[PDB]
Design a binder for this molecule. Structure first.
Ligand SMILES: Cc1cc2nc3c(=O)[nH]c(=O)nc-3n(C[C@H](O)[C@H](O)[C@H](O)COP(=O)(O)OP(=O)(O)OC[C@H]3O[C@@H](n4cnc5c(N)ncnc54)[C@H](O)[C@@H]3O)c2cc1C
Ligand SMILES: O=C1NC(=O)C2(CCN(C(=O)c3cc(-c4ccc(C5CCCCC5)cc4)nc4ccccc34)CC2)N1
Length: 255
C-alpha cells in the first residue's frame, strides 16, 4: 500500500533516536509486529528503508516509528528533523509545524504477530530491536481492558538488553504503565545493561544467563509449548537457537 503522507511530529530521544509520528491513511490497517518501508524524498528521492510500526493499531490517527541514526539515511533523517525543529524553537509559531512528506509501503508481517496465538512467549530484544515488542505489549494492554480472557496468551517473559542505560527511556512509560496495570501478572519484565529505570523491576547487569532463564521458563510451562521471539544480533540468535532445541521451544530462523 503506497501513499503520500507526512511526519506530523517527532520526539528526539536518547542514543540518537527519532520518535516519528506519521499520519495514518484512512485505508491503512496493520497488526502489532508489522513493519513498513518508508521513502523520504528530502533525504533520498529513490531509497526505501524498513522500520517497525512501534505503535499499536488501536491508536487511530498516527503510526509511530522509532528510528535510530546508525548510518547514511537515518543520520540524514535525524539531521533533517533536528534542524527543522531547531529552526522552529528560534522562529516557529507563525504557522503550525510543516510536515516532512514521506511515502509508506506496507504493512509487511513477521511471525512475531503469532505471539497472540501462543500460550507462553519469550520476547528477547537488543537495542531498538525492542520496537516490534513495544507494539505487541501496547496491543496486549488495549486487548485486556477490552476483551479480557479472549487471548490464549497466558505468560509473556520479556528480556530487553541495552549497552547504554539512557536507551530504556524510549519505552520506560510503557514499561511503567504495564507494571501499574498488570495485577494478574501476565508479564515478567527483565531489563539488562550489558530500580535503575525507576521501575519496580530492577535493571540487571551483564549478559543474561540464557541457559538458566530457558531452564526456569521450561520448568514453569512444562509440558506445554513455549514460543521464543527474538529481535537482535546473530551471535545471540545462535545461542538462543541451540537453547530452543535443548528445551523444546519454538524458534523462527530470522538471523
Ligand atoms: C523489518 C525491519 C524492521 C526494522 N525496524 C527498525 C526500527 O524499528 N528502528 C530502527 O531504528 N531500525 C529498524 N530497522 C533497521 C533499518 O531498516 C535501517 O535501514 C537501518 O537500520 C539503517 O539504514 P542507514 O542508511 O541509516 O544505514 P547504513 O548506512 O545502511 O548502515 C547500516 C549499518 O551497517 C553498517 N555499515 C554501513 N556500510 C558498511 C560497510 N561498507 N561495511 C560494514 N558495515 C557497514 C553501518 O555502520 C551500520 O551499522 C529495521 C529493519 C528491518 C528489516
Ligand atoms: O538495536 C539493535 N541491537 C542490535 O543488535 C540490532 C541490530 C540492528 N537490528 C535490525 O536492523 C533490525 C532487524 C529486524 C529484522 C530484520 C529481518 C527480519 C526478517 C524477517 C523475515 C525473514 C526473516 C528475518 C526480521 C527482523 N527487525 C528490527 C526491528 C526493530 C529494530 C531493528 C531491527 C536489530 C538489533 N539493533
Amino acid at each position: 500500500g503506497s501513499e503520500p503522507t507526512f511526519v506530523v511530529n517527532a520526539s528526539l530521544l536518547p542514543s540518537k533516536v527519532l520518535g516519528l509520528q506519521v499520519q495514518r491513511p484512512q485505508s491503512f490497517n496493520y497488526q502489532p509486529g508489522d513493519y513498513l518501508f518508508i521513502k523520504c524524498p528530502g533525504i533520498s528521492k529513490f531509497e526505501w528503508h524498513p522500520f517497525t510500526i512501534s505503535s499499536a493499531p488501536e491508536m487511530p490517527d498516527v503510526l509511530t516509528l522509532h528510528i535510530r541514526a546508525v548510518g547514511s539515511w537515518t543520520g540524514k533523517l535525524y539531521q533533517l528533523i533536528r534542524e527543522q525543529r531547531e529552526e522552529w524553537i528560534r522562529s516557529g509559531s507563525s504557522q503550525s509545524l510543516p510536515g516532512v512528506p514521506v511515502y509508506i509501503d506496507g504493512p509487511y508481517g513477521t511471525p512475531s504477530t503469532h505471539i497472540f496465538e501462543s500460550k507462553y512467549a519469550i520476547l528477547i530484544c537488543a537495542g531498538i530491536g525492542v520496537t516490534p515488542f513495544a507494539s505487541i505489549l501496547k496491543s496486549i494492554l488495549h486487548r485486556n481492558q477490552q476483551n479480557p480472557a479472549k487471548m490464549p496468551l497466558k505468560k509473556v517473559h520479556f528480556y530487553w538488553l541495552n549497552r547504554e542505560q539512557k536507551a530504556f527511556e524510549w519505552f520506560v512509560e510503557l514499561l511503567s504503565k504495564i507494571e501499574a496495570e498488570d495485577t494478574n501478572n501476565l508479564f515478567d519484565l527483565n531489563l539488562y545493561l550489558t530500580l535503575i529505570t525507576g521501575l519496580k523491576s530492577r535493571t540487571k547487569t551483564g549478559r543474561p544467563d540464557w541457559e538458566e532463564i530457558f531452564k526456569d521458563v521450561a520448568k514453569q510451562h512444562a509440558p506445554d509449548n513455549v514460543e521464543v521471539f527474538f529481535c537482535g544480533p546473530t551471535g545471540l540468535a545462535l545461542q538462543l537457537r541451540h537453547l530452543c532445541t535443548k528445551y523444546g521451544f519454538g524458534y523462527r530462523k530470522e538471523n
